[PDB]
Scaffold this active site. Structure first.
Site, short mmCIF file in Angstrom:
data_model
loop_
_atom_site.label_atom_id
_atom_site.label_comp_id
_atom_site.label_asym_id
_atom_site.label_seq_id
_atom_site.Cartn_x
_atom_site.Cartn_y
_atom_site.Cartn_z
N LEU A 152 1.00 -1.18 -0.01
CA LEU A 152 -0.28 -0.19 0.22
C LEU A 152 0.91 1.44 -0.04
CD1 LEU A 152 -2.44 -1.16 2.52
CD2 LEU A 152 -3.37 -1.28 0.29
N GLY A 153 1.93 1.29 1.00
CA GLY A 153 2.97 2.73 0.79
C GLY A 153 3.90 2.16 1.61
N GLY A 159 6.73 4.52 4.23
CA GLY A 159 7.37 6.03 4.33
C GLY A 159 8.16 5.53 5.16
N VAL A 187 7.57 0.15 5.23
CA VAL A 187 6.20 -0.46 4.99
C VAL A 187 4.83 -1.25 4.92
CG1 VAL A 187 5.76 -2.05 2.26
CG2 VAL A 187 8.02 -1.51 2.81
N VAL A 188 4.07 -0.66 4.58
CA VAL A 188 2.74 -0.66 4.54
C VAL A 188 2.19 -1.72 3.49
CG1 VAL A 188 0.20 0.32 5.90
CG2 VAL A 188 2.83 1.35 5.74
N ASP A 191 -4.33 7.67 13.14
CA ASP A 191 -3.14 8.79 13.09
C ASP A 191 -3.18 9.37 14.77
OD1 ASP A 191 -1.99 12.23 12.69
OD2 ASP A 191 -0.83 10.17 12.19
N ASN A 220 -5.01 12.35 8.22
CA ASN A 220 -5.24 11.65 9.31
C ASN A 220 -6.73 10.58 9.21
OD1 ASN A 220 -2.45 12.45 9.87
ND2 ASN A 220 -3.31 14.33 10.59
C1 LIG Z 1 -3.93 2.03 8.62
C2 LIG Z 1 -4.77 1.80 7.21
C3 LIG Z 1 -4.13 1.72 5.76
C4 LIG Z 1 -5.30 1.16 4.75
N1 LIG Z 1 -5.02 1.59 3.35
C5 LIG Z 1 -4.71 2.86 2.58
N2 LIG Z 1 -3.73 2.92 3.39
N3 LIG Z 1 -2.42 3.73 2.37
C6 LIG Z 1 -1.89 4.28 3.41
C7 LIG Z 1 -1.91 5.97 4.36
C8 LIG Z 1 -0.87 3.71 3.94
C9 LIG Z 1 -2.77 4.14 1.18
O1 LIG Z 1 -1.92 4.74 0.45
C10 LIG Z 1 -3.62 3.65 0.64
C11 LIG Z 1 -4.14 3.96 -0.83
C12 LIG Z 1 -5.08 3.02 -0.86
N4 LIG Z 1 -5.67 3.39 -2.25
C13 LIG Z 1 -5.31 4.64 -3.34
C14 LIG Z 1 -5.48 4.73 -4.62
N5 LIG Z 1 -7.07 4.89 -4.32
C15 LIG Z 1 -7.68 4.70 -5.93
C16 LIG Z 1 -7.75 3.21 -4.31
C17 LIG Z 1 -6.97 2.73 -2.78
C18 LIG Z 1 -5.56 1.88 -0.55
C19 LIG Z 1 -5.45 2.23 1.26
C20 LIG Z 1 -4.92 2.68 1.13
N6 LIG Z 1 -5.83 0.75 5.57
N7 LIG Z 1 -6.04 0.76 6.86
#
Ligand SMILES: Cc1cc(Nc2nn(C(C)C)c(=O)c3cc(N4CCN(C)CC4)ccc23)n[nH]1
Length: 268
Positions: free
Chosen positions: A18-19, A21, A25-26, A149, A136
């Site tokens: 997912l990301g 930072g 890594v998440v 957050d 957040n």
């Molecule tokens: C803690 C926690 C984090 C989380 N999920 C996501 N976190 N993050 C960061 C905050 C780690 C994303 O960046 C992200 C991006 C997506 N895409 C983004 C693009 N969009 C088009 C579809 C969904 C989905 C879920 C997440 N669930 N519980």
């Protein structure tokens, strides 16, 4: 130990990154083969033991449908894992900025409602968030917005205030008494909520879009505020504007804000 909060790493599976930072890594995965989870793999040397213990306690004591839930931790291995509820639409700020959703104002007010419910709960537990903003909050598959957050989730989200060791201050979400005197209180959370409502109704515009943080501080010192977003009715603007009273004690509580928001929702 952490009792039931200590997750068996054998019960985890990984699906998608997912990301990545400051704190690591998440990944999106599953827990017990059935529950969707966000799994944070903590970068070694990004947080101390005491910090972890403190922030774990925070998340373990607080629980609400509109707060992003901690599921558990893996602390007997390296790297450490933090396991949280999965939010399929990610960060609220990015969600709002996706023009394809073509949100109805009813949807926008429900986003405000979701957050207000979470904040009312935090208020009831005497917990101050300190960094309430769209960046957040997270959004699940059902469009439900939840506050994150806080506690360990600060590290999961790679919080920029935390990762900048206080360098990046949320000026645009801060009342005059914070910017002048560092006077934090429930009423500084209330102010932040009003700015968040503005973010929602502005579909993720940066508050004070033409100002620096410095010009922003001056603007509010003059008693001036954020304009009414076009998508916000006069009744909705009254609610957000009530959060920005110069006098902290004149600002509503989250209980009052929730009642105000519901009344407008039923009126549509
Ligand atoms: C803690 C926690 C984090 C989380 N999920 C996501 N976190 N993050 C960061 C905050 C780690 C994303 O960046 C992200 C991006 C997506 N895409 C983004 C693009 N969009 C088009 C579809 C969904 C989905 C879920 C997440 N669930 N519980």
């Amino acid at each position: 130990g952490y009792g039931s909060w200590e997750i068996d790493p054998k019960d985890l599976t990984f699906l998608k990154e997912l990301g990545t930072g400051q704190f690591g890594v998440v990944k999106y995965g599953k827990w017990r083969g059935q529950y969707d989870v966000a799994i944070k793999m903590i970068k070694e040397g990004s947080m101390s033991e005491d910090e972890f213990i403190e922030e774990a306690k925070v998340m373990m004591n607080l629980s609400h449908e509109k707060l992003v839930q901690l599921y558990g931790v893996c602390t007997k291995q390296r790297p450490i894992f933090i396991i949280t509820e999965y939010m399929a639409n990610g960060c609220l700020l990015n969600y709002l900025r996706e023009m394809r959703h073509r949100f109805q104002t009813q949807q926008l007010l429900e986003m405000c409602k979701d957050v207000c419910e979470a904040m009312e709960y935090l208020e009831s537990k005497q917990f101050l968030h300190r960094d309430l903003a769209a960046r957040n909050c997270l959004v699940n598959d059902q469009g439900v917005v939840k506050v994150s957050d806080f506690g360990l989730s600060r590290y999961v989200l790679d919080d920029e205030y935390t990762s900048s060791v206080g360098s990046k201050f949320p000026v645009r979400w801060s009342p005059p008494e914070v910017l002048m005197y560092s006077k934090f209180s429930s009423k500084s959370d209330i102010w932040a909520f009003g700015v968040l409502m503005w973010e929602i109704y502005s579909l993720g515009k940066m508050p004070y879009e033409r100002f620096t943080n410095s010009e922003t501080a001056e603007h509010i010192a003059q008693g001036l505020r954020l304009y009414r977003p076009h998508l916000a009715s006069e009744k909705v603007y009254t609610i957000m504007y009530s959060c920005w009273h110069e006098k902290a004690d004149e600002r509503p509580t989250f209980k009052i804000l929730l009642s105000n928001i519901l009344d407008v929702m039923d009126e549509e």
